[PDB]
Amino acid sequence: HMQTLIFLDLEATGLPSSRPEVTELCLLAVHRRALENTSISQGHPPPVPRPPRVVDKLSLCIAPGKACSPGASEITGLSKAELEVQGRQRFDDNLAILLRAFLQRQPQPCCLVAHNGDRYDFPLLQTELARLSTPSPLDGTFCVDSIAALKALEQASKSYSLGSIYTRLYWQAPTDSHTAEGDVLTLLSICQWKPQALLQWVDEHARPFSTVKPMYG
Amino acid sequence: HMQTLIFLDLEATGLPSSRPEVTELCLLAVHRRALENTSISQGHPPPVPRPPRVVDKLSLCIAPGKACSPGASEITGLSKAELEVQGRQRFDDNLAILLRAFLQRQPQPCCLVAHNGDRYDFPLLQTELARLSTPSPLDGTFCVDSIAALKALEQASSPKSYSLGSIYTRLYWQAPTDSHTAEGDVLTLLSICQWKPQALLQWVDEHARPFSTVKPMYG
Ligand SMILES: O=c1ccn([C@@H]2O[C@H](CO)[C@@H](O)[C@H]2O)c(=O)[nH]1
Ligand SMILES: O=c1ccn([C@@H]2O[C@H](CO)[C@@H](O)[C@H]2O)c(=O)[nH]1
Ligand SMILES: [Mg+2]
Ligand SMILES: [Mg+2]
């Protein structure tokens, strides 16, 4: 039984072929009680659920070592030059120390939830952490891809991009697409669609983050 | 010249008389360039500005050592019982580590900005940090009270309540959202501080004082 779900989103300099680097990271830590007490979804469509009162949130912009592709910069609204002029620092040991302290405030066991995590966010995060001297702060942490989760939840009762799912469930467009915090809030909203069912799915398919292979070396 | 403004709000178990303890804390770190490149406020009323794209955010719920007053739990929507059952940790050394590493990512010098901060947020934070073995992570950090800031700005602008909501409604003709939540109040404060960013930064540089000179509320 996971006690904490940590909704995660990364934005980066480009697509996996590009050997991308992280430009923004958001973590939203929600205790399982706070999630499973999100009210049922009635109506077609139901209203967009309200986030739980009690949450822990960390959102950071990160200077990459290489430029964002024009396309990445258009959709994320971020660029290496603007990140550097505002003094953003690299993905370095102090950041790992920060994440470690943030994670240690969460009850265990703890599971990251990210949309397309299995093929982007998690392997990329593994790569950024591998470059550090610091031992990984995520080794004891679990992770799941919300795509597989929502596929299993919908067929228990067609695109699976974040926006497609949110639109299909609430008949509205998400807000603040491809911003780390905005995407995390959209994912939380989707996961509050059937919190108990999702939580049971997570408990069954969560896997240790230490088993995730890096995106590149 | 302050290079980073860190908008800060604390919620707690009650008023200073009751020797309160922190229950929620939000920091919103904004580089000075992101603030002064906010679109110039025009129109009457102007729209509530968008937050700058580039920000660092940290919001945390904290288990207090004492229960909240009836009123405090009502306005904040928090209670010691609910924070505990959701596993929230107390104001401890690990939190001080988190704060230290967060501040270290911001360009220096860095200034805290909190509404009524001189009479509540800053002295209470100093009291919480003083209970810890850890040397204060705020020793090299500055702080200002946005009440003084907004008063000074409106006195120069125009040769009356200064509560957060009264200012926000006067500037924008709408009520704030999510009052007495840590992140909600920080977002409200940022919006009123984006009213006149250049003049605000000028006032902050003139009046930023070391957090080390802040007297603890109690203890
Ligand atoms: O159409 C898209 C979607 C995503 N990405 C890259 O993938 C990252 C994660 O979504 C983005 O920040 C961006 O770098 C693109 O380049 N194009
Ligand atoms: O009417 C009020 C205003 C503030 N507070 C206390 O002051 C904190 C914010 O200043 C709140 O979280 C609460 O603890 C009250 O108890 N009552
Ligand atoms: Mg994503
Ligand atoms: Mg306040």
Author numbering:
A (entry chain C): 10 to 166, 175 to 234
B (entry chain D): 10 to 168, 175 to 234
Reproduce passages from the article.
Three prime repair exonuclease 1 (TREX1) is a crucial enzyme in mammalian cells, consisting of an N-terminal nuclease domain and a C-terminal transmembrane domain. TREX1 acts as a 3′-to-5′ exonuclease in the cytoplasm and the nucleus, and has multiple roles in cells (1–3). TREX1 is a member of the DEDDh exonuclease family and adopts a general two-metal ion mechanism for catalysis similar to other members. Our results show that RNA and DNA/RNA hybrids are substrates of TREX1, although the activity of digestion is lower compared with that of processing ssDNA.
